[PDB]
Amino acid sequence: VQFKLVLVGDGGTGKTTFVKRHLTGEFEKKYVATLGVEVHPLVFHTNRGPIKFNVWDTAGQEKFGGLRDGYYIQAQCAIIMFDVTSRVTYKNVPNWHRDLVRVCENIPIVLCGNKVDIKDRKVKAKSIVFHRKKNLQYYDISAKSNYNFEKPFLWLARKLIGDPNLEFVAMPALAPPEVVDDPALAAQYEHDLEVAQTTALPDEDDDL
């Protein structure tokens, strides 16, 4: 049970960060521009079984755009991303939407305003109305604070499966191995752990 999802939007808006948060849990602080597209499988467990999104994380910079709308072929859903701290990224949302729906005429689409954790917000809530006439779902999100970070996939899953009562459920948790190697017998243990201890954890001012 798998669905192709294309993710589009201006460069630097947070598309790859958002995907990596969902894939691995990490928060990537650096901006490494995507070159063309990167495809990542992404599985969610629901009360209706597992759902798999094949996430086509496309490039937002024009000089890295690769195949451009060629990536959209046979997409079954999409996320359009912009950055609420950068008004030009919202002004370009109609352009990304135009290219997308010319290729995918009848798919569910989420519009996402990212970086709502930043205090100096430039694209205010009341400005954001593009989704109304285009029948897109909209969410304020933050890949950094994870505010609403699950909502785009939960909404898409409800639309693709055709069940508005679909929910994410706790994945099964098998009993883990009981016989394990002593790591302290592994020789490189002393060097490997010292490096870990003397590399500071990031964001020590955060609440967790």
Partner: protein
């Protein structure tokens, strides 16, 4: 959930990191409830941690007696330790984890519970 046969010995909110030695940096693996779960049939105690909202497992391993909690140079509310068999993402893997808590008191409670669970597992 595969947790119905277990007793929650201890629960605490936490953020889990794994060390990426290629990049020599810590990377977040999940934030949520860290639970010590004692299987009522075998009396074995595991750490099980799920992410908020997605409920996805970011830690699943036995609290082995061989493991040792060590401090991190930057934090008075964290522990790092080597784990040799975590199955959060499928087949058993080794990681250097770091786990951070809301306060130094929580971190000290976690260490005392971690070691209590190690004693339980030695039986």
């Amino acid at each position: 959930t595969m947790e119905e046969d277990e007793e929650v010995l201890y629960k605490v909110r936490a953020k889990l990191f794994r060390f990426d030695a290629d990049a020599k940096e810590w990377k977040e693996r999940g934030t949520g409830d860290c639970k010590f779960l004692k299987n009522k049939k075998t009396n074995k105690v595991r750490i099980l941690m799920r992410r908020d909202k997605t409920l996805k497992i970011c830690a699943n391993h036995i609290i082995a007696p061989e493991y040792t909690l060590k401090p991190n140079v930057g934090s008075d509310r964290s522990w790092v330790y080597a784990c040799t068999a975590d199955i959060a993402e499928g087949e058993a893997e080794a990681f250097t984890f770091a786990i951070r808590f809301g306060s130094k008191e929580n971190a000290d409670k976690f260490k005392e519970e971690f070691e209590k669970a190690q004693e339980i597992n030695k039986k």
